[PDB]
Amino acid sequence: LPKLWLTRLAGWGASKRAGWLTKLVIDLFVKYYKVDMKEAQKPDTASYRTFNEFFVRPLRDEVRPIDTDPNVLVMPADGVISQLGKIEEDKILQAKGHNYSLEALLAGNYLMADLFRNGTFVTTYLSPRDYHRVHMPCNGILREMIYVPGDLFSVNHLTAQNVPNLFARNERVICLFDTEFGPMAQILVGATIVGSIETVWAGTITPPREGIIKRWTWPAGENDGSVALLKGQEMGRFKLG
Amino acid sequence: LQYILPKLWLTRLAGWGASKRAGWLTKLVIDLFVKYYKVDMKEAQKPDTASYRTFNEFFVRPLRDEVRPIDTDPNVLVMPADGVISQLGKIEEDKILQAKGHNYSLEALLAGNYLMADLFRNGTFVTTYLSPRDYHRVHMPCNGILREMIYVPGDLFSVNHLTAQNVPNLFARNERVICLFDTEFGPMAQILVGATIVGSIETVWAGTITPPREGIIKRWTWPAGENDGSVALLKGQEMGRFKLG
Amino acid sequence: XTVINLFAPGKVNLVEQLESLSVTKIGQPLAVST
Amino acid sequence: XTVINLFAPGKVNLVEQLESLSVTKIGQPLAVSTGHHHH
Numbered sequence: 001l002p003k004l005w006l007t008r009l010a011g012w013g014a015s016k017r018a019g020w021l022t023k024l025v026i027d028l029f030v031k032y033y034k035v036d037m038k039e040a041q042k043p044d045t046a047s048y049r050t051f052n053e054f055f056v057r058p059l060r061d062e063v064r065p066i067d068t069d070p071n072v073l074v075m076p077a078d079g080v081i082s083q084l085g086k087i088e089e090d091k092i093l094q095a096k097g098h099n100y101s102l103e104a105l106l107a108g109n110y111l112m113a114d115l116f117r118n119g120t121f122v123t124t125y126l127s128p129r130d131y132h133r134v135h136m137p138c139n140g141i142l143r144e145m146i147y148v149p150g151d152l153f154s155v156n157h158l159t160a161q162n163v164p165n166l167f168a169r170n171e172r173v174i175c176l177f178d179t180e181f182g183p184m185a186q187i188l189v190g191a192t193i194v195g196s197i198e199t200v201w202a203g204t205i206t207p208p209r210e211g212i213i214k215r216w217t218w219p220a221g222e223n224d225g226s227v228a229l230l231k232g233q234e235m236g237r238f239k240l241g
Numbered sequence: 242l243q244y245i246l247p248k249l250w251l252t253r254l255a256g257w258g259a260s261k262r263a264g265w266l267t268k269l270v271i272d273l274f275v276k277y278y279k280v281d282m283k284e285a286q287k288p289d290t291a292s293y294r295t296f297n298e299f300f301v302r303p304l305r306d307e308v309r310p311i312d313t314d315p316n317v318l319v320m321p322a323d324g325v326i327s328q329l330g331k332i333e334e335d336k337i338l339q340a341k342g343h344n345y346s347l348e349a350l351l352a353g354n355y356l357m358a359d360l361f362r363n364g365t366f367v368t369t370y371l372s373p374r375d376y377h378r379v380h381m382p383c384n385g386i387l388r389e390m391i392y393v394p395g396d397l398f399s400v401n402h403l404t405a406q407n408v409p410n411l412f413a414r415n416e417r418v419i420c421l422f423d424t425e426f427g428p429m430a431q432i433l434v435g436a437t438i439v440g441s442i443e444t445v446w447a448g449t450i451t452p453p454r455e456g457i458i459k460r461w462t463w464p465a466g467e468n469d470g471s472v473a474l475l476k477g478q479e480m481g482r483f484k485l486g
Numbered sequence: 487x488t489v490i491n492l493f494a495p496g497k498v499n500l501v502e503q504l505e506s507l508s509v510t511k512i513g514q515p516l517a518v519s520t
Numbered sequence: 521x522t523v524i525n526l527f528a529p530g531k532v533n534l535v536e537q538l539e540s541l542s543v544t545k546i547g548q549p550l551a552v553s554t555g556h557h558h559h
Contacts, residue, residue: 002247066513073498073517077489081508084500087492101457105490107353108391108458116492120500120517124510126487134489135512146353149395149414151456155488167490169394169456181519182494189488211396211414212346213353232513238487304546311547315559318532318551320544322523328540332526350524361526365534365551369544371521379523380546400522402541412524426553430526439521477547483521 003152003192004209010193011207011241014051026054033129039063052239055194059131066232073137074232076186078130082123082160092121095161104168105187107148107213112176115183123167125155126238132194133237140177140184142227147205147214148172155191173197173205175235178220188236199236201227207241243408248397249454252440256452256486259296271299278374284308297484300439304376311477318382319477321431323375327368327405337366340406349413350432352393352458357421360428368412370400371483377439378482385422385429387472392450392459393417400436418442418450420480423465433481441486445479446472452486496520530554 016022026045030037037043041058048054067074083093090113091099103113126132150171153163160166172189188197190206198204202216219226229235261267271290275282282288286303293299312319328338335358336344348358371377395416398408405411417434433442435451443449447461464471474480498517510516532551544550 064512067515069515071519072515073493073519074513075510075516076491076512077510078512079487079489079510081504081506081510082488083506084504087495102492103460104457108460109353110460111356115494118495120491120493120495120498122491122500122516124489124491126489131512132487137491137516148353165455165457167488170488181497184494185490185492187490187492189490191487194487210410212349212410215348215353215355309546312549313559315557316553317549318527318553319547320550321525321546322544323546324521324544326538326540326542326544327522329534329538332529347526360528363529365527365529365532367525367534367550369523369525371523376546377521382525382550412522415522425557426531427528428526429528430524432524432526434522434524436521 007152007193007195007241011196014055014240017049022048022051025051029128033127035129039131052241055132056237056239057131064135064232070180073181075124076137077124077126077134079124079126082125082157084122085120087116087119087121089117094166095157098161098164100165100168104165106174106185107146109146112144112174112185116185125157127156128194132239133234134186134188136229136231136233136235137186138179138181138184138231140179140229141221142175142201142218142229143178143220144174144176145199145202145216146174148174149209149211149213152190152192152195155189171195171197171206171209173199173236175199186235188238190238193240194238196239196241197236198239200229200234243398243404246437248437252397252438252486255438256441259300259485262294267293267296270296274373278372280374284376297486300377301482301484302376303378309477315425318426320369321382321480322369322371322379324369324371327370327402329367330365332361332364332366334362339411340402343406343409345410345413349410351419352391354391357389357419357430361430370402372401373439377484378479379431379433381474381476381478381480382431383424383426383429383476385424385474386466387420387446387463387474388423388465389419389421390444390447390461391419393419394454394456394458397435397437397440400434416440416442416451416454418444418481420444422474431480433483435483438485439483441484442481443484444481445474491516493517525550527551
């Protein structure tokens with residue numbers, strides 16, 4: 001199967017308003033994936049005009065309490081830990097017997113990579129089941145965003161264990177922030193079907209897929225037109241297309 | 242069809258074919274190629290189309306030293322490839338001309354490398370087009386010390402003038418190798434951009450860069466001229482080539 | 487989908503409980519300052 | 521294929537004769553240094 005063509009198709013489908021057929025595909029999805037519509041702001045599977053509207057569904061305000069201890073960096077996405085720990089120089093663990101370059105992940109940006117040499121990484125896996133928006137792990141001033149064209153491999157555990165440099169070659173958006181904990185990078189990596197990435201400050205980054213690397217910068221906190229986000233605040237999301 | 246075709250699969254196929262040693266069938270495909278494309282085997286170091294064990298050996302053929310005289314005036318930067326000028330002139334800030342009403346970012350071409358782009362903001366650019374007809378090795382336009390090489394994964398669109406006029410950011414999205422040199426004319430970039438079928442890039446100092454296609458950006462550095470393990474090339478010296486694969 | 491966080495060296499320690507396949511919910515503790 | 525050269529600002533002038541589709545042969549003049557060098 002051709003992964004891009006399939007993704008473009010699913011995105012056409014996911015964005016069409018088909019009332020009963022949308023509800024059907026949503027309901028099959030909810031059932032097959034064991035989705036917990038309890039936590040949804042609108043639990044009635046009939047409340048969603050398009051499939052994508054459902055995929056990107058909000059949660060009930062109360063159900064994601066943000067630990068308020070200002071020394072605690074909180075989790076940015078629902079799902080499960082893929083891998084985490086020390087960055088062994090430039091080496092990041094993907095799966096058993098599969099490492100990848102920090103520089104590769106950051107699309108050859110040797111300056112950014114240097115900030116994180118021997119630092120800490122967390123790779124969170126969002127399954128179709130899970131809420132598909134991404135929240136800030138701490139307060140931060142947005143400094144840099146880099147869009148990286150790439151492949152649309154699956155990112156499930158099977159694929160992680162078998163495709164080399166998976167996260168360094170799949171289409172992704174790199175967000176760099178200044179924080180009270182020094183520089184912090186939060187990277188949204190797309191997958192097959194679910195290849196559309198947004199940020200709250202820039203809307204939908206992809207599609208379209210123009211095949212080139214784009215970089216945006218913002219000033220330091222103390223300046224006109226700087227962008228600040230708070231621990232636990234929504235910063236971006238994934239949808240189909 | 243440029244978005245329809247599976248450009249990689251076709252290129253992998255042609256590369257399988259171009260690298261097989263098939264005596265009579267190699268000579269046949271070479272000869273059809275030579276005839277259809279008006280190739281001037283007069284200029285070749287081995288003009289007998291039968292002298293080439295594989296198609297790729299032919300594609301990457303050397304020329305007779307004497308047919309490419311290198312202007313020795315050290316004020317003159319010479320052409321690095323046989324073919325025709327696509328476009329050239331001033332880099333309008335970050336803007337490079339691709340075709341009429343099609344610009345592309347200098348930063349895009351350099352795969353987001355804002356440091357390298359700064360070297361060339363408001364500078365000069367030349368885009369040379371090699372057709373299948375032409376000799377497919379690339380020579381230095383002047384003396385240089387190799388400092389930086391960046392491999393950039395990307396698409397394998399055609400790069401003919403028709404495609405240039407129609408696919409946006411063609412050279413910024415197609416697979417390529419960026420070579421940065423120190424020269425007596427300051428920093429100089431020489432970028433080898435692949436195309437469909439002709440997607441394999443080599444340099445003289447590193448062999449074949451692609452394939453394989455590992456889908457990530459790779460960067461290598463070399464020291465300044467006066468050092469152990471530095472790499473220096475002379476005006477008109479071969480620095481790389483394109484082949485099928 | 488996937489989200490990747492990078493933190494500067496000696497700035498945070500990951501909560502030791504967390505390991506491959508540990509469940510994550512937005513706002514639960516990920517790491518603690520040093 | 522295609523080859524792209526980048527030069528720093530005020531370092532070279534392209535031969536004025538050259539335009540889109542002008543034929544290129546290795547070793548022919550492409551540009552001339554803005555600063556004088558000598559043998």
